[PDB]
Structure formats: structure tokens, C-alpha cells
Design a protein around this ligand. Structure first.
Ligand SMILES: [Cl-]
Ligand SMILES: [Cl-]
Ligand SMILES: [K+]
Ligand SMILES: [Mg+2]
Ligand SMILES: [Mg+2]
Ligand SMILES: [Mg+2]
Ligand SMILES: [Mg+2]
Ligand SMILES: [Mg+2]
Ligand SMILES: [Mg+2]
Ligand SMILES: [Mg+2]
Ligand SMILES: [Mg+2]
Ligand SMILES: [Mg+2]
Ligand SMILES: [Mg+2]
Ligand SMILES: [Mg+2]
Ligand SMILES: [Mg+2]
Ligand SMILES: [Mg+2]
Ligand SMILES: [Mg+2]
Ligand SMILES: [Mg+2]
Ligand SMILES: [Mg+2]
Ligand SMILES: [Mg+2]
Ligand SMILES: [Mg+2]
Ligand SMILES: [Mg+2]
Ligand SMILES: [Mg+2]
Ligand SMILES: [Mg+2]
Ligand SMILES: [Mg+2]
Ligand SMILES: [Mg+2]
Ligand SMILES: [Mg+2]
Ligand SMILES: [Mg+2]
Ligand SMILES: [Mg+2]
Ligand SMILES: [Mg+2]
Ligand SMILES: [Mg+2]
Ligand SMILES: [Mg+2]
Ligand SMILES: [Mg+2]
Ligand code: NA
Ligand code: NA
Ligand code: NA
Ligand code: NA
Ligand code: NA
Ligand code: NA
Ligand code: NA
Ligand code: NA
Ligand code: NA
Ligand code: NA
Ligand code: NA
Ligand code: NA
Ligand code: NA
Ligand code: NA
Ligand code: NA
Ligand code: NA
Ligand code: NA
Ligand code: NA
Ligand code: NA
Ligand code: NA
Ligand code: NA
Ligand code: NA
Ligand code: NA
Lengths: 337, 132, 53
RNA sequence: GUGGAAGUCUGUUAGAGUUGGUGUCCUACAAUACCCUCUCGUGAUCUAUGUGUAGGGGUGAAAGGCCCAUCGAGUCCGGCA
RNA sequence: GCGAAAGCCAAGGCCUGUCGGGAGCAACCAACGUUAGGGAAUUCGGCAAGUUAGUCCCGUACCUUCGGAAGAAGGGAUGCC
RNA sequence: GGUCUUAAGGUAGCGUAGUACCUUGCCGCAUCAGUAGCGGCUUGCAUGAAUGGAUUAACCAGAGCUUCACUGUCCCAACGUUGGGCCCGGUGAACUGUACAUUCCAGUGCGGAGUCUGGAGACACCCAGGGGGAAGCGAAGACCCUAUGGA
RNA sequence: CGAGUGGCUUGCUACCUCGAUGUCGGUUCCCUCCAUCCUGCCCGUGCAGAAGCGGGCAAGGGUGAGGUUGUUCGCCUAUUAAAGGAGGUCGUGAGCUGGGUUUAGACCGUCGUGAGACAGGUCGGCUGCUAUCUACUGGGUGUGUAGGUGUCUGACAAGAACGACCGUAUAGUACGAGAGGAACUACGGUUGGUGGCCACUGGUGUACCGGUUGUUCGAGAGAGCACGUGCCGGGUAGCCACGCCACACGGGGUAAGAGCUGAACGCAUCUAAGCUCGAAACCCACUUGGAAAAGAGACACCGCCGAGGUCCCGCGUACAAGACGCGGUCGAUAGACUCGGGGUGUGCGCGUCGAGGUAACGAGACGUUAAGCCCACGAGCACUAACAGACCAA
């Protein structure tokens, strides 16, 4: 009677098209719980190695024992919150009100922007506070950019600009917290936002693969047995029934596969350090040598080596934070062999 | 069931002919079903080390031959992973005939056994000469 | 640990342990060693191997 | 031991045949093709050339097979508008 | 080498089985190689593919019209100096 | 039934058959499970003696079934190789075409509509794809009936 | 006995098509229905418990593997939470298959004088087409909104992004004479689905290195061919799955249901007004897309004779064209070289040994030699090449 079977692939990550921005954009943010702070950071994927860890889980029978864990190494140097954007609550949703900038700009920010020559910070600040007084102040986020120049393995110098939100105690306090960060020079580090052991949400634009067939793109079957030898091997049975007389968008077809934005949830931050403790012998294949500020993320992260990846405090973690895990060993063995 | 404490790539399928690691009188076993398992369309039901499979007696004494008994997978050629990363694999695929209480039917267990099997089937464990 | 074949130090979180029929245990550091072993080659006869060196 | 019989065996020797792939082709390279597979291969064998049998007639180890891409009665023209 | 077999190479012939240039050259298609563990679960059906293989030595069942079955099966050997 | 139709009234054998409707007959072998296969039984819808019956070694690109071996047939797909495919120069057809035509959901209609009705959606053009629909293209249906048709 | 609903079966009819709407079964891939098999929440019980039985709401998800048979159907086995039924031209042949029905060949049985027949059986017996329109999956070029760069907003759109099971503690506890034997909650794992990634294991790897058979270049050295690697052994990068990582809860409103207050009807009453609760189902939450949302958006800065863009040049985190991203001497973008990191497995030559042989000769052994050869990665390094310069633009 033809056995049932779930459809091939998910309909939740579509359309399966090329991403608009190589730099990921979070469409959600963590809640305003603790003290005022920036709700995200970024870095550049380098590669993978394994780490030996002590079982941190109190509910595990193996608690306290050695444990080998896969880790993706990401070079996460300091970023710079160059401006403070305030949104106002309008009858059509949130809308950008104004921005408060600075004067101290990184030598190569103009490779992307039309850096401000004449700006009035105070006025914008005033407008933001007046709106706040009126009770129309939506949320507050900081314009941020990376320093690719700080990462040798990454060829680009043109900084990746992205807006990150600030979640704080009160609106009045996080506003101040924001303004302060910016005034200095907006310089901040992964330490400032995260701590080893916390779970982060890593967003990134996956490894591109160009056009691919249904079999790879949607996980449909290959023609089987005799059917496989008739002239059809990797094409689905049919595009749909006689009626409705049209091909439904839900049928697995050929197209752009890869180079899409993805936001992987609950990624444990095994360790945030600095130096060359993680670099592989002979260099990370197709990347290079890591000798600077870095983050060790448990498991896989979307994207190819050199790609920009964004961090965010897990918006829906399942486990309780188990701070600063014990790292008894980090493999430095060559990734060639 | 209770966690194996090891990741397993099932190396057997329904219809697979394996070795009966005991003195029951049954030499060769044929996998029929995998307890607690439900597959998916076209997928041939898979069994691995640490599973309680249903078996048919292919070879052995006329008495045991052609019977349908339950058993536990003790060894398998396809590797398995341990917490420390290392893979572990055996020289053959083998199971031990078992009763309703998960107690070995026979008296003696031939060949070595996986340590992970112990956490699940104690009576089978405390009947093994070697535990790797 | 050390590879029961060539003799080099097995990088932690790597390798395979072949359990023999009799119950013996052989820790390999790589497929290269496992495969040279399957060919019946003894580590002592192969120069590249530390055992031989 | 000699002898060397056979509608004898193996065999892409030459040569002949045409089982499966229901592959390739299917406005073809081709109005019957291509590739692999497969059968026979000293005999009721295969083959060239010459020669005989002509249409309700030939020819047919018989399939209504074949008689110049034409066959349960060839082809051409006529009867015929 | 058993060979008018394969494979390699002379002599002799040819680059005219007559459109080219470019993209590590994507999907998909035709031919095809290799795939861990499992091993016909596939399918109307092992279709397709694969396995086996040359030579010598040992050895060889039921059945039989005494010819055969039969290379039954099964076991061993095989290079170079 | 313990003869009658119409001459005789099925003998040897074979038998659920390439013949058995009932039928997946019953029993057994084999398998976890066998409308299969083999063996036995057999009242045979409707076997049977040159309309040849039975049996049978050898032979077979003949039909069915079992085992060992084998393996990408399958679990479940991957990577690779060669030729295409894609882009450029040159060469250069055909099929098809009442008209209009960006359609989708419903309805209606000779009861199976891109074109009617109501709504919904819809900026134009182009490249690649696998073929859902145009009851797609190709052939004055082989099936069926009809004709005071043909052979 | 009576009243109906459906349009799956069968029958009836002869409306539609005979200048053809390709068959049955299967497969593959997509959507749907609910009369619900499982799962969630409930009511009754001939509800002690456990296991059930019957009923209600409910279509989110799931509903699988095999033996005979062409079968659909059905019979059977073992697993399972359960292995539900049905619609989409009995969905699906410009997708596949072709076992069955139903051409031409042949046999058997039955019938017939016979040709020959069969709503009997059987063996064999072909699957055409380069897509014009439309449809959708993905990719571009233009115009509209009316100079540019960067950052956003969110009308709407998609999702199952999550479904289910087993185990431990609770507990040998509640309940029960006993046998037997729960739950709330908290944990650990499994399976199915999903998205991503390759440190690890595994496959590939006609890059690469070695061994070796035949033959050709006189031998040697070193090579060609043996189908697109002769074969065998090993195998880097990358790509992969058989490998590894991630995928809630909680709120809000409801259904069935359990109730509160409460009248019509002084009482009673969950309902009539009002209210408190309560489903895997709905909404939010989360993920993906999304200024062409014609109300065609917001902010910031730069610029209107100059901001910015295209072409050009060296390249890829990108890629079928187009698109996209980066670098361009104020430079490490690519190549060369040298290192590092890797793959093979110990080079040519020479020396000693070498069964033997008068000697010639000699397969092979050891040393020189972790050697020789090789690398799709990394680094150092401006040596070579990123030169010259063109165009557009308020
Ligand atoms: Cl198929
Ligand atoms: Cl099963
Ligand atoms: K018709
Ligand atoms: Mg075909
Ligand atoms: Mg590697
Ligand atoms: Mg290694
Ligand atoms: Mg199936
Ligand atoms: Mg002969
Ligand atoms: Mg022959
Ligand atoms: Mg003649
Ligand atoms: Mg005839
Ligand atoms: Mg395999
Ligand atoms: Mg089968
Ligand atoms: Mg099947
Ligand atoms: Mg074959
Ligand atoms: Mg019978
Ligand atoms: Mg007679
Ligand atoms: Mg209209
Ligand atoms: Mg007609
Ligand atoms: Mg007729
Ligand atoms: Mg007539
Ligand atoms: Mg049609
Ligand atoms: Mg209902
Ligand atoms: Mg649904
Ligand atoms: Mg149909
Ligand atoms: Mg269907
Ligand atoms: Mg169709
Ligand atoms: Mg067709
Ligand atoms: Mg076609
Ligand atoms: Mg047929
Ligand atoms: Mg048939
Ligand atoms: Mg037939
Ligand atoms: Mg070659
Ligand atoms: Na084919
Ligand atoms: Na074809
Ligand atoms: Na159709
Ligand atoms: Na004689
Ligand atoms: Na042929
Ligand atoms: Na005539
Ligand atoms: Na005439
Ligand atoms: Na030419
Ligand atoms: Na008779
Ligand atoms: Na013959
Ligand atoms: Na293959
Ligand atoms: Na179509
Ligand atoms: Na009705
Ligand atoms: Na009807
Ligand atoms: Na018609
Ligand atoms: Na069909
Ligand atoms: Na449901
Ligand atoms: Na069945
Ligand atoms: Na139809
Ligand atoms: Na069909
Ligand atoms: Na067809
Ligand atoms: Na709720
Ligand atoms: Na716009």
C-alpha cells in the first residue's frame, strides 16, 4: 500500500538561494536579564583539532574523566563598536532613530565606509534621550566592524561591519553603557562578552557548492536497481500528480545549494585564549597559522576556513552553564596525514 | 536502555549470519529483528554491538537448529568509538543466546567481549573470560 | 600510548584497537600500520618504522 | 602401447549465427545501426560466381516464412473518372 | 604462447573513423574505476555486475543406453638465479 | 442399478499435471515466515496409450526451484575517469503553429476550461534545469459496433 | 424496523472522447481528507493495581522490514509506540519498470466435421519525440520607487524542526490476601526526521611513491604501451558518511473535559451574561526568505565636478553564462625559491657478501641511505606578475 515516509529535506530553510550578505545577520537577540552588555561578537574560522577535556557534566557517570572533544578554532581578535544606533517604537514596528559616532577610526575602515568627517554626536544623543523621555525608545544596538588586518591568514583588510544589540538592566543604564563603550573607541573583546563554558549561537554563511541535484540538495534517493540503468540515475520520479496541473514549489528540484545563512544553536565555548596554543603543525590546511586571540568552539561551525562567523549568547540553551572547563590537552598534530 | 558509553556504527542487518559465542549447541546465528528498533522506508533494519537481537539458529546441534531465540551482540567487525576517541573493532561478529531474564542460555562464553556490553547485560558480563 | 606496530607515540584521541580472535589487543596509530600488518609484514623488516630503527 | 574415429568437445582461427542487456540509438551513422554478452565453428557446414523454378504460380527442416525496404496472393501499366 | 589468440613491435600505411577554442570543467546524461560493515535484504526473476580461470600433480559421487557423467567435486603446485 | 444412450465403457501406466474449476487441495521437506519448488496422497471440473502412454543416460542462449561461492542488486550512497553537457568562433536543420495567451483557486459549461463567471495573484526581458499541465507532439483507433465493404 | 451520509467497491446509464485523454500491479516524488492505528489531553468501566475494554477532542508527527504470489487484495514471520484507511484522470509510462491482461509463434485440456473457439492453463513475444506556451526550482539583465556607501526595518511568506521510544532514581514503593505492580518529577541514552561540519574513524583520491608481469628503445640507467592507471601495495589535499556537532522550554488563547459564581425557575443548575482551568492540535517564541510592501520603507555618513561605480590587473571564502567576494606596490593576491608540514618506503653508483661456476658469469643480501622521488597545504620571501590606462556618474 506504499509505506509512508517523511518528505525529503526541510521546507524551513528556503528559498534555497544565494545569501544576500556573506556577513550573517541575527534575527533574534537574547533577553535583557543581567547587566548592560553587547549581545554578540565575531571572528574568522580557521579549522579544526581535538581537545581532551574533563567531564564537566554533574549528571554524567563519567563526570571527572578524560574526554576527547572535537573543536573548531576561530580567530577572534578585538572588534570596534564605532556607533550607537537607537530605534524608536512606531505603529509599523521598530525604526532607526539616530546614531552616535566617534572620531577615532581604524586606518582601514574607509575600504567599506564613507567615514564621518562632520558629525554632531551630542544632538543625536539628545534626540535619543528625548525620545526615551517620551517613552518611544525601542532598543539600542551598536554598529560594529572587524579588524581582518589583525588576522594574517585572512587576506581581506576590508572590515566586516555588522550591527549587534545591547541588552542591559534598564534602558537608561544600558544606554549609558553603550554611549561609554563608543566614546572611547568602541574597542572590545570576546572576554568582555563571553566566558569559557557558556553556550553561544554561531551564525554563518555555509560553504557554497553551486548548483546541485535533488539527491545531494534534498537527499532524495537515486534510481534503484534496473531503473538506475535506463537513462535516469539522479532524477526524481515525477514533478507531481496530474492534478493540480502545475509543479508545486515543495518538490525537490535542482538549484543553488550551499552559501546560505545558518544559525547553529547552543555551541559550547570550550575556551577563549590567545597565542598559538591551538595551531596545527604545518599550518591549518588552506588557512594558516594561529597566533593571537582565539575561541575554541565545540564541534562544527557553518562556513569554510577564512569565513566570518558571528556569536551570540544562546537564546534557547537546554543546559545550565558549566564555567571554565578543564582542558588537559589540545592537539597540535598536523592536519595533513 | 542504559547508555552504552560508546558510539556504535551498526555493522549488522536483518538476515546477517553471525557467530554464537557460547556452548549452547548453536554455532551460527541469523539476525531476525532488533529489539526496540523501528526503521524507515527501504532501510534494512540495523543491529550493532550492545543490541538485543532476535535470532534464528542456522547451524549447530539438531536440537538447537531451526529455533528462534533472543541474543545479545557481543562482537562486530565494524568499529565503535569510545569517549577517549579511540575506535575499537573485532575479528568477527558475534552474539550470545539469552533467555527472558537476559541470562546467558549456555554455561561458557567463547572468545573476548566488549566492556560496554557489561553495563547492559551483567549476567552475560560476569560469564566472560575476556573483556576488552 | 605507543603503536603496537611501528612504535611511535599514538596522538591522543586517535587510532584504532584491533581485538584479536583469542582476545589479544593491538593498538594501531594509523591505517598504514594496520594495512602493512594485514600484508603480513613485520614492523622489524620495514625501515621507516621506529621498531626497526 | 599403437591407431586417430566423431552431424565429438574447448576455441571472437577464418567464417557463420543472433540469447540477454529489454543498454546506446530511436528527426539515427543506419527505413533493422553500435557496444558488451551469447551460439556454431569437419559438416544436414560456410561461401563466390554461374544456372533453374514466376504470381492462385515458385520456393518453404512449415514461421503463412520468402519471391529486390512490396506478400493470408509480388511489381508495373491498363480496365479506371 | 598451444595458437592464424591477447599484449608489445617491425615493414608498409596513416594522424581523413576530418570542425575547433575555453572553464579543476557545476547540475544532469553516456561509457567506466574503487567503495567500509552487511551480503540478494534488491527484483516478476541475481536482470546488471561480480566470482572462477592458463598448465602439472593428487583425487573424483549419483546416475548410465557403458559411450558418458567428468575439467564432477575437492586438495596441492606454479617466479627468478 | 446388483442394464440404458450410441459401438465400447478407460486396461499398463501417469495424475492437483505446461491437463485439476473448486485451489494457496491435504500431509511432509525447506524457511523466522514459502499462492513458489520438490515428495506422497489423489475421487482425474475435463489424464491415458504411434490424437501414442510411461520411463530415461547424454545434449540445451528452452520453463520453475534450492545450496555454496560472489558481489554497489539492496541497506545508502560517495569519490574518481573519459566523452558530452556550460561559455566562445565557424557551420546550420527539423518537429510544430486558428487566434489570443503572466497565471492560480473555485465555479460553470457537451458532465475533464490559460481564454466563460467570481475572486486571488501578476513590473518587463533573459540564462540553466528536471518534465506537472496545454485531456503536449507523432498515427482519419488495432479494441467495440455499424456497412445489404473487402480479403 | 425505520432515517440518512459518503462516493473507496460493484452494478446501472450511454452525457463526454473512437482524425487514440497509453493498461493492471509496482516504483519514485509531491499535496490532501478523517470515518484516528500510535502519540497529546479527556469521559465511562463489569475503573483496586498492572494490563485492558468502550467513548470524546484532535490530522502536528509517525504508521517501518521481510517469506509465497504479476498481483491489488490477502495469507504468513519477526520486530514496533503503532506498524490506520482513503482522495489527487482507480495522482504519477513527453519519469522508470513491463511480471499480468490483450497481436502475430507453440503446447495442454475442453468444444467443434472443420477453419477454429475458450471470461481455461502454459512458454516466448518492441516502450517513439531536440519543450513553442504554461508551471515550478535556482541564476542574471533592465525599468519603477527618484547621487552614493554602509547599517537596518518587516508587510508578509516557509518550517515538523522537531516526532517517538527505552532505561535509572522515584520503587519492589502507592494499590493488593497474594500474584503482581503504577505515577508526578529528575536524569541517561536510542530511533526517525532536520540543518551544518571533516579534528577523529571510514570511502575515494587514473595527484603521488613503491613492487612487478609482457614487449619496445642493444644491456644498464631511464622510459612508452597493455583504455582511457597493465596489475598489485600504500596514499596527501579536497569532496564525502559509514564519521562528528546542533535542533527547548516557556508563555497566550481554545477543543473534548473538569469546575467557579449565577439567573431565567425563590431551590437546583459549569452557561444563558460573567469567570478559573485544560490537547502532540492554534497563536507567540526559534530558524529561513523578504524594499517591487505602488503607502515601492528607515538611519548614518559621503557626494552633486566629483562620492561612488564599471572596465582593466593578480586571485578565490564564489561560480554552468551572468552574478558574488578579496587583493592590486600606502601590497603578501598568484607564481618561483627556501623552509615547515605531509605521501611513499630506502635512489643511481660504488664497496663487501652471494648458492655455485676453471673462468666468464651470477638471482639476490648488507652499507652508503629516515635514503631517492613526490605534494592540490602553511610560512618566510617583493625576485617575477598585480603594469598602463580607459569609461561612467547627480
Ligand atoms: Cl528507482
Ligand atoms: Cl525486523
Ligand atoms: K475512443
Ligand atoms: Mg529501458
Ligand atoms: Mg587531514
Ligand atoms: Mg593520522
Ligand atoms: Mg521497498
Ligand atoms: Mg561439433
Ligand atoms: Mg566451439
Ligand atoms: Mg547462386
Ligand atoms: Mg498461424
Ligand atoms: Mg562494499
Ligand atoms: Mg527477496
Ligand atoms: Mg521486496
Ligand atoms: Mg547475467
Ligand atoms: Mg503438488
Ligand atoms: Mg490404440
Ligand atoms: Mg478572471
Ligand atoms: Mg477512424
Ligand atoms: Mg477484430
Ligand atoms: Mg468476404
Ligand atoms: Mg497525455
Ligand atoms: Mg473526529
Ligand atoms: Mg498534515
Ligand atoms: Mg492511475
Ligand atoms: Mg497513490
Ligand atoms: Mg506523465
Ligand atoms: Mg512512454
Ligand atoms: Mg521524451
Ligand atoms: Mg508481459
Ligand atoms: Mg510469465
Ligand atoms: Mg506470458
Ligand atoms: Mg596509461
Ligand atoms: Na543506460
Ligand atoms: Na535512455
Ligand atoms: Na500523464
Ligand atoms: Na587400442
Ligand atoms: Na548481438
Ligand atoms: Na497473384
Ligand atoms: Na486503374
Ligand atoms: Na579537417
Ligand atoms: Na481421450
Ligand atoms: Na541447438
Ligand atoms: Na559501481
Ligand atoms: Na511538462
Ligand atoms: Na448517499
Ligand atoms: Na460507478
Ligand atoms: Na480526438
Ligand atoms: Na502503474
Ligand atoms: Na495526526
Ligand atoms: Na506480501
Ligand atoms: Na488517465
Ligand atoms: Na504504469
Ligand atoms: Na513507456
Ligand atoms: Na496552551
Ligand atoms: Na524600493
Amino acid at each position: 500500500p506504499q509505506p509512508s515516509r517523511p518528505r525529503k529535506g526541510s521546507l524551513g530553510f528556503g528559498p534555497r538561494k544565494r545569501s544576500t550578505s556573506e556577513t550573517p545577520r541575527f534575527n533574534s537577540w537574547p533577553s535583557d536579564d543581567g547587566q548592560p552588555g553587547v549581545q554578540g561578537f565575531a571572528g574568522y574560522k580557521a579549522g579544526m583539532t581535538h581537545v581532551v577535556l574533563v567531564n564537566d557534566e554533574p549528571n554524567s557517570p563519567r563526570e571527572g574523566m578524560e574526554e576527547t572533544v572535537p573543536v573548531t578554532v576561530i580567530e577572534t581578535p578585538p572588534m570596534r563598536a564605532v556607533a550607537l544606533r537607537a530605534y524608536e517604537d512606531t505603529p509599523y514596528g521598530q525604526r532607526p532613530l539616530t546614531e552616535v559616532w566617534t572620531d577615532e577610526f581604524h586606518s582601514e575602515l574607509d575600504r567599506t565606509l564613507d567615514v564621518p568627517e562632520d558629525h554632531d554626536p551630542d544632538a543625536a544623543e539628545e534626540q535619543i534621550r528625548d525620545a526615551h523621555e517620551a517613552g518611544d525608545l525601542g532598543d539600542l544596538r551598536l554598529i560594529t566592524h572587524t579588524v581582518p588586518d589583525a588576522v594574517p591568514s585572512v587576506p581581506k583588510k576590508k572590515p566586516d561591519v555588522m550591527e549587534t544589540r545591547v541588552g542591559g538592566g534598564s534602558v537608561s543604564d544600558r544606554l549609558d553603557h553603550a554611549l561609554d563603550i563608543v566614546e572611547d573607541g568602541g574597542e572590545h573583546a570576546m572576554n568582555d562578552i563571553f566566558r569559557a563554558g557558556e553556550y553561544a549561537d554561531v551564525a554563518g554563511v555555509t560553504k557554497g557548492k553551486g548548483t546541485q541535484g535533488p539527491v545531494k540538495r534534498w537527499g532524495v534517493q537515486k534510481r534503484k536497481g534496473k531503473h538506475a540503468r535506463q537513462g535516469w540515475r539522479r532524477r526524481i520520479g515525477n514533478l507531481g500528480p496530474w492534478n493540480p496541473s502545475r509543479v508545486r514549489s515543495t518538490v525537490p528540484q535542482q538549484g543553488q545549494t550551499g552559501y546560505h545563512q545558518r544559525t547553529e544553536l547552543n555551541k559550547r565555548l570550550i575556551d577563549i585564549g590567545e597565542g598559538d596554543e591551538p595551531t596545527v603543525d604545518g599550518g591549518f590546511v588552506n588557512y594558516g597559522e594561529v597566533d593571537g586571540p582565539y575561541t575554541l568552539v565545540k564541534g562544527s561551525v557553518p562556513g569554510p576556513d577564512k569565513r566570518l562567523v558571528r556569536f551570540r549568547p544562546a537564546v534557547r540553551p537546554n543546559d545550565q552553564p558549566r564555567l571554565d572547563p578543564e582542558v588537559r590537552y589540545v592537539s597540535n598534530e598536523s592536519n595533513q596525514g | 536502555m542504559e547508555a552504552l558509553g560508546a558510539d556504535v556504527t551498526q555493522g549488522l542487518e536483518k538476515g546477517s549470519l553471525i557467530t554464537c559465542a557460547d556452548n549452547t549447541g548453536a554455532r551460527e546465528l541469523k539476525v531476525i529483528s532488533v529489539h526496540g528498533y523501528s526503521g524507515t522506508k527501504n532501510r534494512l533494519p540495523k543491529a550493532g554491538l550492545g543490541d538485543k537481537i532476535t535470532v534464528s539458529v542456522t547451524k549447530g546441534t539438531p536440537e538447537m537448529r531451526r529455533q528462534v531465540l533472543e541474543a545479545v551482540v557481543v562482537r562486530q567487525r565494524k568499529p565503535i568509538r569510545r569517549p577517549d576517541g579511540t575506535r575499537v573493532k573485532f575479528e568477527d561478529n558475534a552474539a550470545v543466546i539469552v533467555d527472558e531474564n537476559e541470562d546467558p542460555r549456555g554455561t561458557e562464553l567463547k572468545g573476548p567481549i566488549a566492556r560496554e556490553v557489561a553495563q547492559r547485560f551483567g549476567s552475560v558480563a560476569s560469564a566472560a573470560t575476556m573483556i576488552v | 600510548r605507543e603503536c603496537d606496530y611501528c612504535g611511535t607515540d599514538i596522538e591522543p584521541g586517535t587510532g584504532t584497537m584491533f581485538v584479536h580472535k583469542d582476545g589479544a589487543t593491538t593498538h594501531f596509530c594509523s591505517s598504514k600500520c594496520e594495512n602493512n600488518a594485514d600484508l603480513g609484514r613485520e614492523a622489524r623488516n620495514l625501515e621507516w618504522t621506529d621498531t626497526a630503527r
